[PDB]
Amino acid sequence: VTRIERIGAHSHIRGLGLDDALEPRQASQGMVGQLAARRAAGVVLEMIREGKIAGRAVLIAGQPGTGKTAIAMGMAQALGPDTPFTAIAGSEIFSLEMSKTEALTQAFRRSIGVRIKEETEIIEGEVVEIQIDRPATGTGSKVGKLTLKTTEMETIYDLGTKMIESLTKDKVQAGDVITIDKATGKISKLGRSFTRARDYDAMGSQTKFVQCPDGELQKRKEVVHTVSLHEIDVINSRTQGFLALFSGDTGEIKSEVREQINAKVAEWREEGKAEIIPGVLFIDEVHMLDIESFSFLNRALESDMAPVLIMATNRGITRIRGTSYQSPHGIPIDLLDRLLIVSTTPYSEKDTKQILRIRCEEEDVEMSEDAYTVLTRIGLETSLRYAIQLITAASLVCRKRKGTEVQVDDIKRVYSLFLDESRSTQYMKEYQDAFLFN
Amino acid sequence: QRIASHSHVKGLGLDESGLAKQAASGLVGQENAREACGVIVELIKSKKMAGRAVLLAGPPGTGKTALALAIAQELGSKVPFCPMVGSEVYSTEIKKTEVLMENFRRAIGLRIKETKEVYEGEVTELTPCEISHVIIGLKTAKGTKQLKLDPSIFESLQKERVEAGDVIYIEANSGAVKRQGRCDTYATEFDLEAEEYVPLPKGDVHKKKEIIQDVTLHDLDVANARPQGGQDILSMMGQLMKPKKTEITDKLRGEINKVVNKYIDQGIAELVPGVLFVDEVHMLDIECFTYLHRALESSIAPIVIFASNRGNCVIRGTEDITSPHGIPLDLLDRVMIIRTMLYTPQEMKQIIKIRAQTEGINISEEALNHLGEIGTKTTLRYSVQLLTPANLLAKINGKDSIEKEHVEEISELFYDAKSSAKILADQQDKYMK
Amino acid sequence: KKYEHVIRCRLSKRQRCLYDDFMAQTTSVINILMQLRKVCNHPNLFDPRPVTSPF
Amino acid sequence: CNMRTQFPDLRLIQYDCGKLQTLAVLLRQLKAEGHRVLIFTQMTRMLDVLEQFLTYHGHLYLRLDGSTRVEQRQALMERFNADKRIFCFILSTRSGGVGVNLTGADTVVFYDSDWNPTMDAQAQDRCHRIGQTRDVHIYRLISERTVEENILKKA
Ligand SMILES: Nc1ncnc2c1ncn2[C@@H]1O[C@H](COP(=O)(O)OP(=O)(O)O)[C@@H](O)[C@H]1O
Ligand SMILES: Nc1ncnc2c1ncn2[C@@H]1O[C@H](COP(=O)(O)OP(=O)(O)O)[C@@H](O)[C@H]1O
Numbered sequence A: 001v002t003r004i005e006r007i008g009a010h011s012h013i014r015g016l017g018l019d020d021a022l023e024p025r026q027a028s029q030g031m032v033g034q035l036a037a038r039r040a041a042g043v044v045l046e047m048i049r050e051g052k053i054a055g056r057a058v059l060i061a062g063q064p065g066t067g068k069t070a071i072a073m074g075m076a077q078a079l080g081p082d083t084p085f086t087a088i089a090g091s092e093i094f095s096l097e098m099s100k101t102e103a104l105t106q107a108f109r110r111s112i113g114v115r116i117k118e119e120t121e122i123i124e125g126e127v128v129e130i131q132i133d134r135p136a137t138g139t140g141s142k143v144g145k146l147t148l149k150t151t152e153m154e155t156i157y158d159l160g161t162k163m164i165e166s167l168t169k170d171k172v173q174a175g176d177v178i179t180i181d182k183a184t185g186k187i188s189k190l191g192r193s194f195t196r197a198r199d200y201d202a203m204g205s206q207t208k209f210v211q212c213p214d215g216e217l218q219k220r221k222e223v224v225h226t227v228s229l230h231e232i233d234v235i236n237s238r239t240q241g242f243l244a245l246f247s248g249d250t251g252e253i254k255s256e257v258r259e260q261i262n263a264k265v266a267e268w269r270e271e272g273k274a275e276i277i278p279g280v281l282f283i284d285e286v287h288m289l290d291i292e293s294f295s296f297l298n299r300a301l302e303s304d305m306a307p308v309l310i311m312a313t314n315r316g317i318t319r320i321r322g323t324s325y326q327s328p329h330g331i332p333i334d335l336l337d338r339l340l341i342v343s344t345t346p347y348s349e350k351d352t353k354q355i356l357r358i359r360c361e362e363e364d365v366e367m368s369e370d371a372y373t374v375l376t377r378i379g380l381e382t383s384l385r386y387a388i389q390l391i392t393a394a395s396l397v398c399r400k401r402k403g404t405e406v407q408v409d410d411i412k413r414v415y416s417l418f419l420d421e422s423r424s425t426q427y428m429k430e431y432q433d434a435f436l437f438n
Numbered sequence B: 001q002r003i004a005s006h007s008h009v010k011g012l013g014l015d016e017s018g019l020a021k022q023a024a025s026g027l028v029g030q031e032n033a034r035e036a037c038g039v040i041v042e043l044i045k046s047k048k049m050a051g052r053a054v055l056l057a058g059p060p061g062t063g064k065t066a067l068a069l070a071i072a073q074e075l076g077s078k079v080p081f082c083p084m085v086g087s088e089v090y091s092t093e094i095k096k097t098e099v100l101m102e103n104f105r106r107a108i109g110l111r112i113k114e115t116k117e118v119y120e121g122e123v124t125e126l127t128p129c130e131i132s133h134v135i136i137g138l139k140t141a142k143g144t145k146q147l148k149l150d151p152s153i154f155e156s157l158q159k160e161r162v163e164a165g166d167v168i169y170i171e172a173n174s175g176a177v178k179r180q181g182r183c184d185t186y187a188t189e190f191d192l193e194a195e196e197y198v199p200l201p202k203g204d205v206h207k208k209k210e211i212i213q214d215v216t217l218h219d220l221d222v223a224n225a226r227p228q229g230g231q232d233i234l235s236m237m238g239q240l241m242k243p244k245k246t247e248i249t250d251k252l253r254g255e256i257n258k259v260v261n262k263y264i265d266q267g268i269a270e271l272v273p274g275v276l277f278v279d280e281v282h283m284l285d286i287e288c289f290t291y292l293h294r295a296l297e298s299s300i301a302p303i304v305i306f307a308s309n310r311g312n313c314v315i316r317g318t319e320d321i322t323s324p325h326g327i328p329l330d331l332l333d334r335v336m337i338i339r340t341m342l343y344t345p346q347e348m349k350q351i352i353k354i355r356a357q358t359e360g361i362n363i364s365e366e367a368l369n370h371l372g373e374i375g376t377k378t379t380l381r382y383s384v385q386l387l388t389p390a391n392l393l394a395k396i397n398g399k400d401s402i403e404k405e406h407v408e409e410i411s412e413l414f415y416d417a418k419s420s421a422k423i424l425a426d427q428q429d430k431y432m433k
Numbered sequence C: 001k002k003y004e005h006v007i008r009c010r011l012s013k014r015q016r017c018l019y020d021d022f023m024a025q026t027t028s029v030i031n032i033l034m035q036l037r038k039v040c041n042h043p044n045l046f047d048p049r050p051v052t053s054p055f
Numbered sequence D: 001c002n003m004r005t006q007f008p009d010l011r012l013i014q015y016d017c018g019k020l021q022t023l024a025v026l027l028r029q030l031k032a033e034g035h036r037v038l039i040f041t042q043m044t045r046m047l048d049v050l051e052q053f054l055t056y057h058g059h060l061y062l063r064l065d066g067s068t069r070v071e072q073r074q075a076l077m078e079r080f081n082a083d084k085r086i087f088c089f090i091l092s093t094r095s096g097g098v099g100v101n102l103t104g105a106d107t108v109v110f111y112d113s114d115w116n117p118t119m120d121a122q123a124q125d126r127c128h129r130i131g132q133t134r135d136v137h138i139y140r141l142i143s144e145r146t147v148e149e150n151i152l153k154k155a
């Protein structure tokens, strides 16, 4: 069965593939080559993990198809789910609901996580017998008694009215393994230790059982709650903020709310209530930001709640959007002075062949050596992405003719069927008048 | 605490005569600029002039924002300091002039004395009195008192599910009823009650506490423009149906001004004029500058500090009108210009050393000299930003201090703007656009 | 049988600040002594953390 | 409600006093090992703060603060000696007289030390007296580099 996540462009990248000294291996964790850029990415990753310096900016710049987004995905996979990683495109900040500065602020504050750790008393056991006595008619005080069992304990609890109501709402029966939090009174059923009586009808197919919990009844467990700054801002902006967390529609959050939240989070950090988990914001194709967005970035990186900012761009000296000024990478020099630039070099023949081999391994495609040579030649002549696509195309063509290994004939067939940019442009020049404009 | 870009700036480093010490309070040069900023700080502390504008002008990396934050630190946390970027006036909800006015009112603070009336105790009687009022009996460790409360308070008590035996907190000013828990004396009756218990209050049933509240004029304007203090259905409806910002009228601001003047006359309020800081002023358009003319001419406005690194540049919103700082000459006539200069290599070394000490990094003299040389070319910002990666490299190699080899390795790994520009120029045909 | 244990405890930041303020106010000794004992007991004996509400 | 009024966190009561943290650790250990604790303090406001802390942590307690009526004192003694749920019994050293028979507990914690060791001895003997069938442990809490070291030295 196929999960919602399938083989994508960067599905083979499991990390930067570095050793302890941040020295890049030639081929490890999907990454091949780009040794200097991977070493720089590892240094940046260590800086992120340390989480002590706020508002650091790194720019991964290089020619198209050199692995900028691959390096970003490797950094994201090496960080792990514990550290926030907000990946957005540059075009996403242009929104009809909010200003560009508001979108950038929300992107920054989605990359900082606030973690609250507290210890609570927890009762987890198998329900042996539950008895609830209620008045037949009219308002009255329900009286009840509950018996819970573990492998080494069994205690009979006298129940109050609100716990009676909670148990009634949850429909707790005998044999249900339930968890009760003493403070909030929340009850969560986590399984049935055995089946219900067979003589009952309209009950459905009984599922699998759950082994009874061991140890003491009333334990003490550590509960961890982690939210981002953006979630706090949204739920504090208005009453319907919890719904705005999912529908968007947050509008523009007042600066007063954000200042208060920053102060409160600082107070929690000083008092040891909460820990701040700085993350990364990755803006792919940062050249689509305009001058106002860059100017906002300039001073927004100077806050102590700012995350590490990583940008990727493949532009040379290009006009800055919203202006008539040519600048390196499409970025104003004032922002370029605030950031370290990581250059990506073009790939050689052996690096291209190794990338093709890793892609074929990821896609479960078996290819011959001659086919690998031809595909590497095509990738060097045309582009890496075209060869990557021809991998799957030739796999399908080979499977159509009831084969098992992708041969040179299949690669030639898919090369004939599907065109790259260069051959398409040539054929369009051959029939220039037929196409509509220019 | 995380270390930010200006975490070492603690003050202006001025002596008693107003002259600028060379290296003090995390500042290394800009003695003339620091003396001017000290004069501006004294002006803000005088609380006499209104709408006096100052422009910090100079190339990037010359510590204009550092000087603004140093002014903020010199003033103290009591004096409001609102930092805003020029790009923030372009909201999709309200007009740009409204944003400017809101930040102007945000810069003016008000310290007002308030008395809180508190009913705190364990509920012993909750008897409705037919719209139905409530008669409530509260007991503490010091006594018992019976109170008659409004039907809104009764509705709040019902919403809090307050029953006989619960410890409650009532604020008489806002009518805010909070149920804290079932009294501790009943914590033994059951074994599983699904309740949070709270001890009996040990003071009196009725308490009056006087506190000092720190508010701004903008807060009063917002409270009076999108009211939520009535606790009626209409307030909730207005909050839910109209959540966006609105263009507050001059009439509301005049009424709020009258209210604040009345409070000050009564002796229960103190005014703190405060400061507004606009960092990227060149990002404003001609309409914003034209509005700022009248806004600065106002007798209510705060002291505004502007910053700009632009040269002879076209003003935004105009076709081809070019002005010395991106600021039209009319507004430049209304500002006092503080000029910041580029730093000498000695000052660059001093700033690098201060930043290294701030980030908890030990750097050798040879490494410090090499990094200052790297900063002589490229920029000071680039040289400063190599400190943490070099520390990480030294830690990886087992060294507790940065040597010259680590700085060289980091500089090889990470390019600066000029080196990347050279690479782009050499390979213009390979990059897009 | 009976046993006696003595456990040493450290002061919080608020307790340390109050203790230093009182020791500075020293320069009668009985009143200072009582205030220091109260500080060592709990700083909430002087003023609880405020319940903050809108104006 | 959360947007309308904010109350100080009950956790900050323990965070502002090292004695409260150490006493929380000690009381958790004592409840784990299955003992009953007597807490003696010289001040009734300290009794109130201890009530807040114990109720926050979930320790059931009874209180005799020296202002309780005499007829209630015997009832409280009988309830504490009869009820096994009541973990702690906060008391004032200067009160209670000599007629109180608290043999139900087996641990005494002195939150603060009295200038007169006789009062602490009486507080101990309230639980160490004849007819008590368990080992008695006495815990004294002293703040480092404070007046309490002088108080302990004098005692
Ligand atoms: N060094 C590398 N190692 C492994 N795969 C790579 C490498 N560089 C690029 N790729 C793969 O090539 C494809 C295109 O590279 P990509 O990162 O999209 O280029 P760009 O930097 O132009 O975005 C991606 O699917 C990526 O996984
Ligand atoms: N006089 C100074 N002393 C110490 N550090 C400085 C000084 N001037 C600038 N810096 C540092 O150099 C960096 C650039 O300052 P910034 O105010 O951002 O420049 P500008 O505002 O002119 O663009 C900041 O991180 C600041 O901490």
Ligand SMILES: [Mg+2]
Binding pocket: A068, A069, A070, A284, A312
């Ligand atoms: Mg990409």
